[PDB]
Every structure is written in structure tokens, then in C-alpha cells.
Amino acid sequence: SGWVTVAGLGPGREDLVTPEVTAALAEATDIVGYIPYVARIAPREGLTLHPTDNRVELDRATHALEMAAEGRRVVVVSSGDPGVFAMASALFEALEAHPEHAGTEIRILPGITAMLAAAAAAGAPLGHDFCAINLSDNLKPFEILEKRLRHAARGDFAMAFYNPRSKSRPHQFTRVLEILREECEPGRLILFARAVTTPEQAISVVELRDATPEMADMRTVVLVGNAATRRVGPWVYTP
Amino acid sequence: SGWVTVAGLGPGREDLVTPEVTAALAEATDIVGYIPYVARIAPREGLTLHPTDNRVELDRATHALEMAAEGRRVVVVSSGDPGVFAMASALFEALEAHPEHAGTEIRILPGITAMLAAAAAAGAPLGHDFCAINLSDNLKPFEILEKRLRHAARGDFAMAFYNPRSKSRPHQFTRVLEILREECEPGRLILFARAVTTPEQAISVVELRDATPEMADMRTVVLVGNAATRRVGPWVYTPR
Ligand SMILES: Nc1ncnc2c1ncn2[C@@H]1O[C@H](CSCC[C@H](N)C(=O)O)[C@@H](O)[C@H]1O
Numbered sequence: 001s002g003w004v005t006v007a008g009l010g011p012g013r014e015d016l017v018t019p020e021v022t023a024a025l026a027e028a029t030d031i032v033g034y035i036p037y038v039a040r041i042a043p044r045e046g047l048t049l050h051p052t053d054n055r056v057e058l059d060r061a062t063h064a065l066e067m068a069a070e071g072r073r074v075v076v077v078s079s080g081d082p083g084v085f086a087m088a089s090a091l092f093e094a095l096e097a098h099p100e101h102a103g104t105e106i107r108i109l110p111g112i113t114a115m116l117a118a119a120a121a122a123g124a125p126l127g128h129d130f131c132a133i134n135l136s137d138n139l140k141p142f143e144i145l146e147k148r149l150r151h152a153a154r155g156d157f158a159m160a161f162y163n164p165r166s167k168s169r170p171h172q173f174t175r176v177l178e179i180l181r182e183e184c185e186p187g188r189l190i191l192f193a194r195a196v197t198t199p200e201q202a203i204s205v206v207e208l209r210d211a212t213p214e215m216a217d218m219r220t221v222v223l224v225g226n227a228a229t230r231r232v233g234p235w236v237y238t239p
Numbered sequence: 240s241g242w243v244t245v246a247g248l249g250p251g252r253e254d255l256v257t258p259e260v261t262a263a264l265a266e267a268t269d270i271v272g273y274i275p276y277v278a279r280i281a282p283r284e285g286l287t288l289h290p291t292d293n294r295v296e297l298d299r300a301t302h303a304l305e306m307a308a309e310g311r312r313v314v315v316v317s318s319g320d321p322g323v324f325a326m327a328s329a330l331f332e333a334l335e336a337h338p339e340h341a342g343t344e345i346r347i348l349p350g351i352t353a354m355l356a357a358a359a360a361a362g363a364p365l366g367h368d369f370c371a372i373n374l375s376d377n378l379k380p381f382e383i384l385e386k387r388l389r390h391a392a393r394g395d396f397a398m399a400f401y402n403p404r405s406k407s408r409p410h411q412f413t414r415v416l417e418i419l420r421e422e423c424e425p426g427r428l429i430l431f432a433r434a435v436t437t438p439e440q441a442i443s444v445v446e447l448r449d450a451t452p453e454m455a456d457m458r459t460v461v462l463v464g465n466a467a468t469r470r471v472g473p474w475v476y477t478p479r
Pocket residue numbers: 011012078079080081082083084085086112113114115161162163164193194195196197198217218219220221222
């Protein structure tokens with residue numbers, strides 16, 4: 001029989017793809033995924049490719065499940081970790097909606113997630129209790145974002161922001177900063193980490209009083225230290 | 240001219256070590272860490288291993304820096320990712336405390352963290368906003384851990400617990416469940432994921448109401464869902 005595997009490809013560099021993930025890629029008959037993820041995979045004999053847009057999902061996933069039934073071995077690929085604001089959740093949601101697909105074999109395969117690759121490049125800003133928050137979740141009303149931000153601020157968590165800029169919400173990030181400037185000392189360290197692990201990696205470290213929305217974009221993860229996070233030489237860490 | 244690399248070995252299975260980390264280990268003159276992690280390192284002329292217990296200490300990091308100054312290529316190893324309640328922090332602490340090693344070349348190499356490896360085995364429990372919390376930090380007063388728990392609860396963050404059963408704070412995880420019952424609905428899914436990616440991996444999902452502390456040990460990472468986090472067959476996920 002066939003299967004569905006949801007594999008994390010890591011933040012970009014090929015030497016971060018686990019050998020686990022590489023093996024499943026060698027077994028697959030089909031690769032489903034967002035255009036530029038699919039493009040990271042060397043084309044080869046017997047491997048049908050199904051690129052897609054970053055939206056939809058659900059049928060993206062139901063489709064993967066329908067292909068398991070015909071004996072196709074399907075890898076749905078994600079950047080970073082598939083369980084971090086990625087395709088793992090859509091699959092199960094698509095699974096709950098279709099009881100006649102329960103019983104297809106499913107495997108979730110972890111990856112180096114963006115925040116930790118960023119952390120590693122900067123030093124150790126996530127070395128204490130930390131949280132991760134999606135800033136382009138359009139199914140999530142803004143009142144919920146604010147409740148996460150404020151409770152992370154007050155609980156003195158280090159933060160990682162995924163999808164800082166939506167342009168669906170043309171700013172929102174502009175708003176996001178305000179809340180931090182309310183809830184945190186102005187010295188709070190802010191890391192703008194863009195295209196981490198790629199040839200165009202650039203990391204900027206800035207205090208909260210000087211943080212502008214323009215400093216983050218589509219290819220950035222924003223790390224926010226807790227109260228004690230500081231510098232040593234070019235590094236950042238949390239004592 | 241040497242360096243210090245802090246390298247994550249992932250949660251156990253060899254096929255989860257990144258090729259970048261496998262390559263640093265092949266370059267090391269010196270490995271510092273918990274020897275059972277690296278017992279099968281390929282032997283070769285010049286390779287030396289420095290056994291430590293499985294704990295974060297500043298003194299080994301200082302020593303790592305000292306060797307790098309003799310020109311040694313030092314890999315300091317951590318399970319999982321080294322920036323996650325692990326040795327990368329301590330290295331930067333030892334560096335800040337020893338300005339004489341300012342300028343040392345330092346590389347921090349990520350790995351699969353236990354939470355995301357357990358999340359993977361479970362399905363997608365950390366699919367939404369989540370936080371990571373260390374429950375065996377004896378360097379914090381219990382006060383701060385509590386402030387962290389209640390705010391993660393109130394922001395409706397899913398959560399992961401590292402080091403649930405403290406050897407020297409035996410009755411602490413009992414407090415954490417109490418706080419959780421205090422701040423969350425009874426049917427809040429909790430997952431105990433034991434020895435993830437090893438042949439003795441075992442995962443139990445129970446409601447908070449039904450959960451007891453002896454469900455966790457030191458081989459375990461504990462995942463707490465959002466309020467929405469739910470069950471589909473053997474799998475756990477959060478809808479959007
Ligand atoms: N190589 C990279 N460098 C910096 N940020 C990245 C990145 N890859 C992904 N991101 C962050 O992740 C967002 C996409 S959401 C996908 C996250 C992915 N599943 C993971 O686990 O990492 C981007 O908007 C950006 O904030």
C-alpha cells in the first residue's frame with residue numbers, strides 16, 4: 001500500500017535536512033507542496049511533482065490522502081518543521097473531515113525550525129522559556145493575537161514571530177510593536193533574522209525603542225528576548 | 240587556530256542528526272559531553288573525548304574555550320537543539336565571564352528538539368502558538384515558573400514541558416498540574432511522550448482531569464494543547 005508523509009525540509013540549507021527526511025524523499029512517488037519547497041527537491045525518475053500555492057490546503061491534503069489509497073507514496077513538504085505553522089495540522093483536519101480516509105498510513109517527520117536556526121546564528125536568545133507566535137493567521141481574529149502577546153510579555157517569555165508581514169493585513173506588525181513597547185522596557189532586545197542559513201543570511205539586532213516594521217518582511221523570523229537577554233561581543237544570549 | 244562548536248544531536252535516533260552536525264563531529268579534535276551520546280564516534284589519530292555528566296555547567300564551557308585557544312577544534316555536544324535549555328547559553332555565559340577569550344571562533348549548530356520530535360510522533364499538537372517551559376530549573380525560584388505557567392494558560396498557548404520530574408524538587412510537577420487544573424478547562428488534552436525516537440518510545444494522551452505526575456519521568460516531554468486542541472483517532476492536532 002501507499003502512504004502520506006509530511007516532511008520538514010528545514011530553513012533552507014541542504015545540510016540541515018535530516019537523513020530521515022532524505023530517505024522518505026528517496027522512497028516517495030509524489031511530492032506535494034508549495035512551489036518553492038517542491039523546487040528544493042532534485043527531480044528524479046518516478047517522482048511525480050505537484051506544486052501548489054501557499055493557500056488552500058485541506059484539498060491539498062485530501063488529495064494526498066486520495067493518492068495513498070491508489071498506493072502512491074506521497075511526501076507533503078514544508079520548510080522548517082512541518083508541525084510549526086505548517087502542513088501537519090491541515091492533514092489531520094482534512095483527516096477528521098473524511099472518516100473513510102482514517103487508516104491511511106501517516107508519518108510526520110520533524111525538521112530544523114526557523115526560530116532555532118535563527119537562534120543558533122545569533123547565539124542563544126531562546127535559551128530560556130520561549131514562545132512562538134504566527135502573525136499572519138487570517139482565521140485567527142486580532143483579539144487573540146493581542147492576548148498571546150500580552151500574556152507572553154507579562155509572563156516574560158522570549159518570543160519568536162513567524163510571518164511577521166502579511167500585506168493581507170497591510171501592517172499588523174506595526175500594531176504588534178506598539179503592544180511590546182507598552183508591555184516591555186524599551187531596552188528589550190529585538191532580532192531581525194532574514195533568510196537564515198541561505199547565502200543571503202542577514203541578522204540585525206536592535207533595541208525595542210528603535211524597532212520599525214520595515215526591518216522585517218516575508219523572509220524574516222523575529223526573535224524577541226526576555227527581560228534579561230543581552231549581548232557579548234557579536235552574540236546574543238539569555239542568562 | 241581552533242574553535243568551539245556547540246552541536247545538537249537530536250532526540251536520539253541517529254537518522255535525525257543533521258549532516259552539518261555529522262560534519263563538525265568528523266572535524267573535532269576534541270569532543271566534550273555525555274559519552275554514551277558519542278560512544279561510537281569513529282576513532283582516529285588525534286581525537287580525544289572529555290566526559291561530562293548530563294548537565295549544563297559553566298566550567299566545561301570555559302575549558303572548551305581554553306582548548307580552542309591552544310588551537311583545538313572543540314565540539315561541545317547537547318541532545319536536541321543546543322539553544323534549548325542546553326549548552327549554547329552556558330558557553331556564552333562562560334564567554335561573558337572570561338573576557339580573555341573574547342574573539343574565540345564559535346559556531347552553534349541546531350538540532351531536532353524533543354518537543355517537535357514528540358509533536359511529530361503525536362501528529363500536530365504544537366501546530367498553533369505554543370511555548371517551551373523548563374520545569375526543573377532550580378536556578379529560578381518557583382515563583383517565576385508559576386508566573387510563566389499562568390500566562391501561557393491565559394494566552395491560550397499550547398505548551399511543552401522540558402525536565403518534568405525534578406530529582407531535587409520531587410513535588411514540583413504536582414504543583415504544575417494543580418496550576419493547570421486551576422487555569423484550564425478539565426478536558427484539556429495532555430500528552431506524555433516518553434523516549435521519543437528511541438525503541439522505548441511511548442506516548443499517552445489523557446485529559447488534564449485524569450492526569451497524575453507519575454505519568455512523566457526524565458525520559459519524557461509533556462505537551463499541553465490549546466483549548467481547541469483535539470483528537471482524531473490516535474492523532475492530536477489543533478484546528479484553525
Ligand atoms: N530560512 C528562513 N529564515 C528566516 N525566517 C524563516 C525562514 N524560513 C521560514 N521563516 C519564517 O517562517 C515563516 C513561514 S511559516 C513556515 C514555518 C516553518 N514550518 C518552520 O518550521 O520554520 C516566514 O514568514 C518566516 O518568518
